[PDB]
Amino acid sequence: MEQEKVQELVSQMTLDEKIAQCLQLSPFLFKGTNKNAELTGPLLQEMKLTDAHTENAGSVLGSSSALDMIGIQEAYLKTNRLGIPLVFMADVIHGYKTVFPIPLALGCSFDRETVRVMAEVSALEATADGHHVTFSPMLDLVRDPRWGRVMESTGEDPFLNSELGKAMVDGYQGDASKLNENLEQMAACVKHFAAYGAAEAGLEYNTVNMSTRELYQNYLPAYNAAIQAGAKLVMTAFNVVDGIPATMNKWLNRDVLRGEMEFDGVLISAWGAVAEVINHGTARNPKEAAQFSMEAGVDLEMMTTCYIHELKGLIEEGKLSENLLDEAVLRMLNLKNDLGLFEDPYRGLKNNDRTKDILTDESRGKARAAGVESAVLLENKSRLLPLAKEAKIALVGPLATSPDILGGWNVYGEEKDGINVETGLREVFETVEVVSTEYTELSEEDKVAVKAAVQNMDVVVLALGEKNEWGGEAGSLATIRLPEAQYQLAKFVQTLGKPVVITLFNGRPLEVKELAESSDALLELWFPGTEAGRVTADLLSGASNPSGKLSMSFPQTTGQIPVYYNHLRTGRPQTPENKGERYVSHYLDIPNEPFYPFGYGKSYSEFELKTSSLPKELNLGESLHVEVTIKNISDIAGKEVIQVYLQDVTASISRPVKELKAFEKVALQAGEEKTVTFELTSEAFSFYNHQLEKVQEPGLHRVFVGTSSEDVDVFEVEVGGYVL
Amino acid sequence: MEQEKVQELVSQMTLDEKIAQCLQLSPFLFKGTNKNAELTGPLLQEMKLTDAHTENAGSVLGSSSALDMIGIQEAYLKTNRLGIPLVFMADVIHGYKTVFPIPLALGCSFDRETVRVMAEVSALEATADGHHVTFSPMLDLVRDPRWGRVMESTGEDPFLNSELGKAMVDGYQGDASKLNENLEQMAACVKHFAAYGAAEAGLEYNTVNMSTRELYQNYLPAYNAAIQAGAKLVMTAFNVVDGIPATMNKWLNRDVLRGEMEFDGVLISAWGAVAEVINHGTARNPKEAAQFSMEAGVDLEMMTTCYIHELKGLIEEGKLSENLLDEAVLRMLNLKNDLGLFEDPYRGLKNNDRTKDILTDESRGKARAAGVESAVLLENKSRLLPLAKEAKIALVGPLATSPDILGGWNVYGEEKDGINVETGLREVFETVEVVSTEYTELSEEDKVAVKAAVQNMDVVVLALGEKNEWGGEAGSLATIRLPEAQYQLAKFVQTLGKPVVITLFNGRPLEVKELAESSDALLELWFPGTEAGRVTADLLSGASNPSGKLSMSFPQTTGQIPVYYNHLRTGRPQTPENKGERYVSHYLDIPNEPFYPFGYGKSYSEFELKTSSLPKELNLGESLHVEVTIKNISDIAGKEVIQVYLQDVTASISRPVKELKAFEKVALQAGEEKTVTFELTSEAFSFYNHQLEKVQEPGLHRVFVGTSSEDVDVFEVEVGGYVL
């Protein structure tokens, strides 16, 4: 509908209707739900919600199905005075029913198209079941694998996170201006604004603190990129940002997000985050919480009641302007209008059962392809991998048969539809003997069984990993190790004298030195989703060739955290020249280097790269064009991730030794050669100074081209002169 | 001498003389040294120093003795054109020849007079050996025990650190305006400006980053308190402060230190930190390092050559004002004048040998007393301690005979003068059988010998600990554990069936859960210094009653870091009510609480505390007076540390759940009662807001009175109304 009519609607709403429009509830709080109706009476009572509230609520989250949505929306519209439909939102993080790899794995793909396809399939399915908005992409920069929510991020690099966040937004939304016509696309919601991933000591919901300059330099760019690409909503974070809970942080939300970033859509609280400013000690009671959160521009309170119970009194007493409320309401109505809800409140579903669009073989093949892009081959000593299809496999461990391979933040996908490692392997390999063990134990009976199977077979596929519940939200591990029984299993298997491949399933970087050293090959599958066992067999058999690269460093030990590629030099860097000397930046007990670095991953192929001759000088404002020729010099088709880093050698702020500024994943047949070109604009040379200006300074830069943050050629360019 | 004559010197100095005045050298770079003459030629060549530089250098650091000083100063004044004596500086950190407990141990004393006496003795001795300045107190707030330099700090509380820093400054300097007359006192130098203890991942020299507000709130107060108390010098830090190396950080050193803190003394670089701004990538070469360091107000370059080789070109070329150089020179000459050097360049020694003042029995008694104040009794199950003098003791382990008990940052103290654990115990206990073991090994032979000694005796004193070189500068440990052989030893000794007291020697919090569980008693001696074994024997025997309290939290495990008592609440605190629920701030694998908290320590005595009735309301600007009656209800004399904490329940910044704001250690005979009063001024109620203003806001505060950060009674005070 026309904008004037949307505005007319705000004019016609009562104060009570406006206030309720800013409330989001679970589906079973509404009449006409078709699941958990037993919960309705008591929770309404505990939250002090009445029909006047629920008949005028703005939004539902976590609808259980299309029939839930239709039932709720049909009942709601029979009673709603002005005919303002509900907007339905859901956590579609890495797939709906067809589950794709967890986002940290998708990070390791270094493949924008993989990420866009994942998001496109997710929306196809989730719109089929009645959802209008997804709480994705998650764009929190992560340096601390203790935090269980690293699985939701694409990792430690702001540029990669930025690029892949744009890819996700494009996949969910397509052309954002046509979300009222394209009903298999859905609105995206960027989360969590901001810097949630810096939770101190890896502890869920904990303190975040960093300088404003560092917040701009590293922690804000991915949110900004997704906002500029047209993400429709933004969601607040649970943490303080410089001492003030994000939800009520007016500088963050009004000055940065709405002002500088020019975001003009709905700002939704994380769950209960409005009320939880009271816990943080920055609001005395729900009245202050409501006032401060509305002052900060939070439009939609997720499942708490501060707005609903307090806004009327604040407005009547003159402590809050009703204009702020009208602004929030208008943004809510505009979101609904963008989704087409005033013309079709059922968004395509009313006369059109799209059941058939869910969990198709096509979508499954795309989830398999995502998993084979995202896995990272970490070790392969003496070409153990790929295995011949006639290889006799002893498949042993806790991940041999476990159906828990879909990942955390899987709200809608079902394990009954997933493919476990055994099932995947048996489709490919004729001879497999299986010995399942428990996740946290290694018995004498297990050892006897394992030794028998290994003796019978020729190679060991040792399937290790995490239960998904050991990560995700409020899954913090102080020690980033598998259960000790799993390391003991690996040590035992090594003694048996056969070659061992470890296929590792997990949601965070772990201490894997003991695994790498106890086996011949190490394949990081992360959690691949629905097709996990087929992803695993295809990579092991060579039907697919591993091409993922680490998007997050793997520490030597827990106590190395945080360790990351884009670090500062210090005043006393350890060099090859001074290594062993006491008075330099080092640990007495471990190397400075992570066990594996950003951008690292192995392949069954071998590749050669060469960079075309670069200018020795550049003007300010001028782009650097980097041309790279890559050849596959092996007999095996595969993909390589070409990475380009920049370093600012001297600056008014100490700058990182490298920062990723371009990447492309290149597919090459045996012997095939291709040429790729990158443009590093002057923005790539730029950074935030002590006064928070984004600046470009003349001086020397180094340009690194290669296949990891370590395996690079280095070039120098002197920037100066005039500004183009 | 008169100020006009000091200014006349500056006026008469040549540019080259003024430049060299800003250089500090090791003693053996000067003619007339009496030690390490073999190091002189090679190092002069490598630094490209000539006679013209050395005959005009401003200062010596690390003279080896009084005769070293006299020889150097005598030669220097024979050749110096204007008669500007050298100033001699040294690292006197926790004692000179009489070595006192390491600073982290002194923090555990919670005893201002102990710290002042330590610094007084240090100065008595250090002046007797010709030193004018010490590079102490170290006031870096520490929350990360991976960092080896925690041993230099008094711990994780800014108030404690502030109070003890002031005590050290008072001890070293006495009345600062009389340093020209009181020649057994010396100048103090506050270090390291600023925030060095926040080194990321515990890694030496590594990146520090925090918000400006947090810098002011927590990281600057102790420096400021020492500066306001009259500390003569400040030394720069190695780290970046918000991306700019402290040494060339103009905002930090010009705006904050000289401006806001009103410091007008010598700012000296940490060792090589001027040259090292190059390594950090914020200066391209020595010429820039010199320019930016002088712009930032660094007066004295410690053992690098940027100033000496580059200032003349910078000033001649008009890139740097000669007036900044004149300001630095005037500060150097004012220090020298403050120390009386223009009247007596030998500061009391030329005709007065003060060897009689070094390592006196009185000074040894003071060090023992400091050691018994600073040790922390952590466990004492079943009243194992104190031991009877007739107790038959098997003394076993790596600290049984090791002479390494003086601590890190012990430049001048000698192990031959220290008292080891065996020697200390045999002065007190008639029957001791000793089995020494290695720091990192546990052999079969050791086990046989330990088993035999334990069989023979009745109780085991298991002496474990760190070598001092595993801490101090560039002694970072990623895992804060003793060598695993020592945990294996404690496990072994537990099997032998006799009661075990573990006496732990160390420079950092460690993972001690496995020790506490493998023994009946656990006594944290840190490194007590020269009287170590007598301290140990006196506490074990009950001649002294433990009275130290932790000034730094002991983590559950390395991955809990950082963990500290003055933490924020979060939006989802774990409470006794919700413990067990998933969606709260917790770890899956460990408690939120540290293994032992701030302000914890046991005693042989038992105490009862009662707080007198408190007002329910307070005006803004008004002090709260807290009166506490304490009684020793046991038959054993002892000391207790009464602690007072304040909480700001609601604020415009999320405030810590508690902050220490007063403490007093109270000595009580059996059955004795005393009353102590504390004034919490309005400053105790104040904090830095989002604008960096220091404010007091009306509202609710809680007042906690007790004997640790956990063992407290709680009161509420509503602050509001008018101001004063």
Ligand SMILES: OC[C@H]1O[C@@H](O)[C@H](O)[C@@H](O)[C@@H]1O
């Ligand atoms: O410990 C203070 C200084 O001592 C010197 O001898 C070392 O060479 C320096 O690297 C160190 O910072």
Ligand SMILES: OC[C@H]1O[C@@H](O)[C@H](O)[C@@H](O)[C@@H]1O
């Ligand atoms: O995980 C998202 C949210 O889900 C809800 O079911 C929980 O009650 C919240 O504590 C949580 O933040």
Ligand SMILES: [Mg+2]
């Ligand atoms: Mg530069």
Ligand SMILES: [Mg+2]
């Ligand atoms: Mg308050």
